[PDB]
């Protein structure tokens, strides 16, 4: 395994997700967005089995959007992540489980605090200052254990990611074709367009 | 009370008979069959001038070679149309060809008697008969241009011409005289428009009536308001001439 990274700083959560889509012998796409906006202040990144990945994401997306309209209200990141967890925990004991790992990054407009949730296909959830799925964490967790501070600015978090990606581009065997980076703060979700030569 | 599939002492099914009364209250629909095509025309009958007349869809496409017009409780026709489109498309998938108009009609009429509170035969899950009649028109290679009248009784008749709805008896007598085996499509268009004008409660115009046809070459098309307007100019002038 796709690179799925997340880091929570002072006022935001940042998600970096690899752009490659590879099937067998060929890199089919180098511009894939491995992410779904669940609500204006909540974002989910995902990696895993070929089909289950987008099917599960889009299914969670549909459900949160429905809730938003029925209640005219945005669910907290915590509430969204618990919903997702239960869905995955159902899945693990069904006829054919969803083989999908997720990061959920949201800004809780009630508290004014950023939140990052790591959840694997088994429905194991944990709240973290930074997280990764697959092999990514084997290179990145020690970089972050070192350079991470709770009070970092968004700009500081992006430099820290750049470092993580550089480590992944040096030591990992697969060409994952760079990452798409997204920031979730009080104002919403935006995409950093300039990461190719920052 | 009484079962929804009960016979009258005259040997008719109550609920089916009462369904025909609902048809009588519907907007008029007329079809003519010619060797150049089959025309279908209807009476929009808006209940208020604030109603946007072109949102009244009483002539629908079933497949490229089959269209239909409805009269009565038009809401009941939706699932009939849906079944009809599925039957036609499915046939094409299974057989790489067009469904015969007769076969398509028979399929729709199969739905009709599938009502009851659990009738001992197959599963008829529908609480009552349909309250809408259907004029189904189309073309196929075997049996040429065709017009069918499909009732909630499950029976269907083929007609050279037929009128259904509130003005049907009047329109039918008029069709009885006017129809012959050598109409042209243009004659048929004018004829439908004329007879609709007679039985209609408004002054017929391109807004409150709609025309359509099915030809082998161009398939089923609903005439836009401009084209119908011209045919009305044309009919008004040919009648004033004598």
């Amino acid at each position: 395994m796709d690179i799925i990274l997340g880091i929570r700083v002072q006022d935001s959560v940042i998600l970096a997700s690899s752009k490659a889509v590879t099937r067998g012998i060929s890199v089919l796409k180098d511009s894939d967005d491995k992410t779904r906006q669940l609500s204006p202040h909540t974002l989910m990144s995902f990696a895993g089995e070929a089909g289950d990945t987008v099917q599960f994401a889009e299914y969670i997306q549909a459900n949160i959007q429905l809730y938003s309209i029925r209640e005219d209200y945005e669910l907290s990141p915590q509430a969204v992540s618990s919903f997702v967890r239960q869905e995955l925990a159902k899945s693990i004991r069904s006829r054919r489980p969803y083989q999908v790992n997720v990061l959920i990054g949201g800004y809780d407009k009630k508290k004014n605090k950023p939140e990052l949730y790591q959840i694997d296909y088994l429905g194991t959830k944990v709240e973290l200052p930074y997280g990764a799925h697959g092999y990514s964490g084997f290179y990145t967790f020690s970089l972050l254990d070192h350079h991470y501070r709770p009070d970092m600015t968004t700009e500081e978090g992006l430099d820290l990611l750049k470092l993580c990606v550089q480590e992944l581009e040096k030591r990992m065997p697969m060409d994952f074709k760079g990452v798409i980076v997204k920031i979730v703060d009080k104002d919403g979700i935006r995409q950093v367009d300039d990461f190719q030569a920052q | 009370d009484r079962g929804v599939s009960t016979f009258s002492p005259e040997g008719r099914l109550f609920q089916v008979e009462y369904s025909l009364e609902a048809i009588k209250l519907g907007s008029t629909a007329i079809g003519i069959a010619t060797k150049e095509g089959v025309v279908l025309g209807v009476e929009k009958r808006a209940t208020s001038p604030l109603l946007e007349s072109d949102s009244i869809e009483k002539i629908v496409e079933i497949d490229r070679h089959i269209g239909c017009a409805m009269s009565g409780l038009t809401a009941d026709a939706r699932s009939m149309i849906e079944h009809a489109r599925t039957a036609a498309v499915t046939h094409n998938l299974y057989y790489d060809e067009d469904i015969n108009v007769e076969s398509l009609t028979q399929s729709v009429c199969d739905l009709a008697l599938r009502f009851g509170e659990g009738a001992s035969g197959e599963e008829r899950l529908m609480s009552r008969p349909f309250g809408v009649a259907l004029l189904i028109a189309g073309h196929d290679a075997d049996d040429g241009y065709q017009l069918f009248h499909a009732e909630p009784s499950g029976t269907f008749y083929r007609y050279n011409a037929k009128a259904i709805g509130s003005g049907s008896e009047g329109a039918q007598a008029e069709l009885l005289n006017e129809w012959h085996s050598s109409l042209t499509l243009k004659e048929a268009e004018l004829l439908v428009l004329k007879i609709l004008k007679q039985v209609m409660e408004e002054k017929l115009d391109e807004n409150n009536a709609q025309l359509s046809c099915i030809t082998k070459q161009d398939g089923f098309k609903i005439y836009d308001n401009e084209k119908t307007a011209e045919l009305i100019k044309e009919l008004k002038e040919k009648e004033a001439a004598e």
Partner: protein, 111 residues
């Protein structure tokens, strides 16, 4: 374990001319190194000027031919005696076969 498939050997051949077509097959039926029959027909007239052969596992072959014959019978019933065109038979056969996608008829069929 039980194996639901066998192989009755058997070879068929179709050639289309300008205004004719042929479907030929040998008449030998086998199981391993034994001959079951020296004359067991394997090419059948199906009506509507359609000939058919489903060569491979004979039990599967027989069911398919049987089931397509019955398809022609109903086509006549359901569509006012219309002749089933060759292209329409072909498409019908596809569905018969594909209906057993996950437990296939173990035959190679030519019409």
């Amino acid at each position: 374990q039980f194996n639901p498939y066998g192989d009755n050997g058997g070879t068929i051949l179709g050639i289309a001319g300008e205004d004719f077509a042929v479907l030929a097959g040998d008449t030998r039926n086998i199981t391993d190194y034994s001959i079951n029959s020296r004359y067991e027909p394997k090419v059948f007239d199906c009506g509507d000027n359609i000939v058919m052969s489903a060569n491979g596992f004979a039990a599967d072959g027989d069911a398919l031919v049987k089931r397509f014959k019955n398809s022609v019978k109903w086509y006549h019933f359901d569509h006012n005696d219309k002749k089933l065109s060759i292209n329409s038979a072909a498409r019908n056969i596809q569905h018969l076969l594909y209906g057993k996608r996950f437990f296939p008829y173990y035959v190679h069929t030519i019409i």
